[PDB]
């Protein structure tokens, strides 16, 4: 409930939505960036009354650099998982598909954030039919002319009010002091600050983060108070607010300063993968820690400082509470840009400006880090060359093929390249000079034809992370990854057939921690003997090769003492019944996360999982577990999160003793579940619960469980209210 | 000498060039389009005094849609034939290469036609160094601000004057009446017209063509006189002059109207290949002739009407006088556009306008013929679909690769496609749905990976012309081209291994006329037995397989009675001496054109060629003939043109009886020629003569021959003055 002073505005907006015309209706929210337009939209999205009243709730991100085809793909992905048929149809075809998808449903609302030009609104409006079902469009805009120019915009342009003072002091106190009370010698400074921010929440949260970072001293509070007083916030000039961000930026440590500045190289509206980005922090040497925690731990700590300062906003978190997807505010992105080019020339972006001509070698040679986001193919066709370029950064929501003749240009022009992520570029093959980059550390790309990883990859002695994505069924690795001592991580989407190591000095790879998806045949004794420090393991392929009762290779997994994350993917031609678990003591004594996919195991097998006393997060995906009768056997003494998706389970019996400490519980696509155990509502730690494609009997059992737990909350000191998801509410 | 009234302007421009500053100097020529800027530039280029004074003379075409990399490639192609090393270097690298290439030479001039914006001039000027050698730049522009903005443009902007009336009447009379005298009842109309064109040569030539097309009657002359009087030519509004072109356009026949309008679909500044374009018409059914001449003959007649009306201007002609490269004036191109979209909606062009968004299906479905010239890859990535599209037209000076996943989009979106020329698009493979186009007639594309022509190509029963270009050494054709009765032409750049026909109805392909270079092993008896009407033959590969004395296959060529054009390319691993011709009577009795490449034959072999009494044009390319002593044996009773390039010939003896009727004579890269026969100057028909990379002894022999022939011209009635090329004059 981190929303202060928006209750009246949200209530009046909701009143506008539920009332008004009975046909199509669009409400525009205009305001100076950072004032709370998207935050208010998110509050409206999560409000219970509107969600109950609206059958379908879609969140859409537009941004300035919107792609209509990409946007239509994004909307289509929210309806049908089988997206292979929609990749070929032209844009109006997916527009009609969206039209009929929302036609099949009931009353719906569409949320369009950060629309910059009226022509974009006109081009996207064609996908929303007028079915006289009181469908609503929550449009957010920076300019009132966008709403004014539309004849169909019958609703008056709602100018969202700026934050009131009563909201100010309370908001800033909640942000910076949390549950603490401000000392008297800082209270007047806080009030003066709140009056001096001119009710702009982004400025308030950024100065709160700055105050947290340095210390809660009266002198520093007076300094920031006079600084914000020296910067009057004009209602028509947002750039001065960037100066306030400067008052935060100077307070960060030099390496942390640098990583925050590098965080701005990403495109606006881009949902950053957390794991990818921590790798960018590590590969570039930005993360330096002379302490007991690992470098990845230090990078996670830095991300935690970023989020708690409200500099980087997290949109989706992992099931266990970790950060999954983070992004930067568009105003903060513009400030980071302005700093990057006009102030400290750390890195530069190459964009198709009004001149429509790309920079030549003379200007490019002065760059140190590049970031090409659109029209990359033309730029690489120009064949640039940078002798002082240390990085190549490029993310796009669309995949761009790699011209073969143009392939050798990138390595030849950048011999001093260190990191090179082209995950939006589909490499067709490997060039010889690509193999000459001895200074490379991070390489990640996609391919649709590469089957054999060549031997010469072993001669890159400075690579730290290697990420490969492909649509091929099986991937063969011929390069000697075992002698690559500095290699730390691997991530693959296909079945990776690692070479069988040969036994010959400290050849043991103590730095290798995570190695993503590996074919079952490579999970041998020698492979795990060379990496005792492995923590995350992933197996992809015919799991029957792993888990035959007579010659199961999981005995080798027993000797891996440092393992905590295991992933198994079943790609066998036949995935029928007959699979069973080995004795429970075979597993590592300190494993934490295991995920079973397409295993087709009997329910009783969790008894093996019942022996592990430290299991806390478990995920079942794509027919991990099934069986008509599920009886809870054994006690999961430390289970916190269990995640089951698309199982034909019918009946489940459970008790509080079986799962004494569960916190997160998820069922998805359970088309045959009869009832959820009532006694689960008797567990105090049971907090969050969700349904998807469940039976009506499951729905009424869920409602009864919610009522019982709410009554228990009325009985005991259950501070954390129960969370139930009525999805879909149709 | 078709230049009237420009003698004074050309003389003063030449005086400016030879005089002025001793360093870099740029003369700009500004004027309303069609006034004669490029024509005056061409006259200056071909003037003898400037060519003698200037060591290096380069012609450069810029146009509005100029590409700096393409332009630099074009300039580099004029210096070194080995262009494989220059394809990889970045733009400034070829700029420096051009800098040193002109540095090695002496005083030079660079001609830049049709420069539209000053920034283009600034970006191209960096390739021209200041060596204090009085180098000159003939720049042609439409706006004086382009010259004014340049600080280095010390020379005053020369505003070229409009043609005077005395030149006018003479110019129009030379254009329309040639050597005839205007009747008195049309002379006053001609004078009134010439005064009413306001001295604009393009208008004069177009109305002369219109008058020629309809008839030289007094009433029609009065009609065109009042029409041009009704259209006053404003000096600042060129669009009204387009109306005058209308007075010509309405006078053409409907099919000829249509083909002229289709001629405008090509990009401005594009040098049209004549053969391709007659193929494009013959495929679209535009050429209809109910007469004895072939359809190709009718198309050539139409092109002749186009050129003699000055609607289409020819830049380079074939050695025998035929049209090789033709183009349209930029003002005429704009008029053709205006007519195409705003008037008769015959065809439309898809371009990246200020909106920066490509048309959708709704507008595209109303189109009948398309023409995409730039940013084609984005358009095909959009995946357009046209149910009423009958043609797909795309030429570019650069090669664009074909995305595999995007490959199927083109055929699926255009099932009613008839012609499809993507010769600027590099196809990587064949898609199955591409093979579903049963309405296709003309297909032409380039590839760097296609080795096997698939069988299903035989199921396209409506194909008339098939053109394939590839860099592969050998091309295999598996499709049954023999049962393709409507197929008329084939053109390949690689060795084409045709399938061996099997003997089984009129299966004989009487419509097949030309079939490009074909691998030697396919020149069998059965192949030539199925196409008795063949006229142009081409063989590419190991010619030793064709021409072994014991088992030569040219006996089969004997039975081909309709053959007139033969091409042979030697791609054998060893091309050493030992090759010899068969007896002369083996050849068809009516052959006209033969070309020998890399044959390595003895000189005496022309005795066989001496037997053919109707040989008129012969070309020797890439070591066709060699030998220290060349003695002329036999009499070429009808030889007109002989063409020899890069031979190590030393001594040649010839007489007038050997070549009694030669007209065009060419020697290129003769690094060892001792002397040219003096008696060749005694031949009356000897008119044109050229040298390239010749010896100094060859140069002085050439000068003596020129002096002797000029003295003979002073003796006899040699109306056609002798033409000698001082090339290079360094
Ligand atoms: N009621 C509120 N309580 C706390 N923070 C808020 C509130 N409204 C806005 N904010 C903060 O203001 C910032 C700007 O939010 P957002 O609406 O996403 O951008 P914009 O206002 O430009 O659309 C957010 O980071 C958010 O944390
Ligand atoms: N002195 C001349 N004699 C005959 N025709 C001319 C003369 N000068 C120009 N023309 C004609 O005028 C037309 C325009 O010529 P050009 O110079 O190529 O275009 P622009 O004047 O727009 O540069 C040409 O087709 C040419 O035939």
Author numbering:
A (entry chain A), B (entry chain B): 152 to 655, 660 to 885
Question: What are the paper's exact sentences on this?
Answer:
Here, we show that the coiled-coil helper NLR NRC2 from Nicotiana benthamiana accumulates in vivo as a homodimer that converts into a higher-order oligomer upon activation by its upstream virus disease resistance protein Rx. We show that unlike the canonical CC-NLR AtZAR1, NbNRC2 forms a homodimer in its resting state.
To further investigate the resting form of NbNRC2, we transiently expressed and affinity-purified NbNRC2 from leaves of N. benthamiana. The NB domain of each NbNRC2 protomer interacts with the LRR region of the other protomer, forming 2 similar interfaces related by 2-fold symmetry of the dimer (interface 1 and interface 3). The N-terminal LRR region of each NbNRC2 protomer stacks over the equivalent region of the other protomer, at the 2-fold symmetry, forming interface 2. Interfaces 1 and 3 are composed of 3 stretches of residues in the NB domain (Stretch 1a-1c, residues 217–220, 238–244, and 270–274, respectively) in 1 protomer and 3 stretches of residues in the LRR (stretches 1d-1f, residues 506–513, 533–536, and 559–563, respectively) from the other protomer.
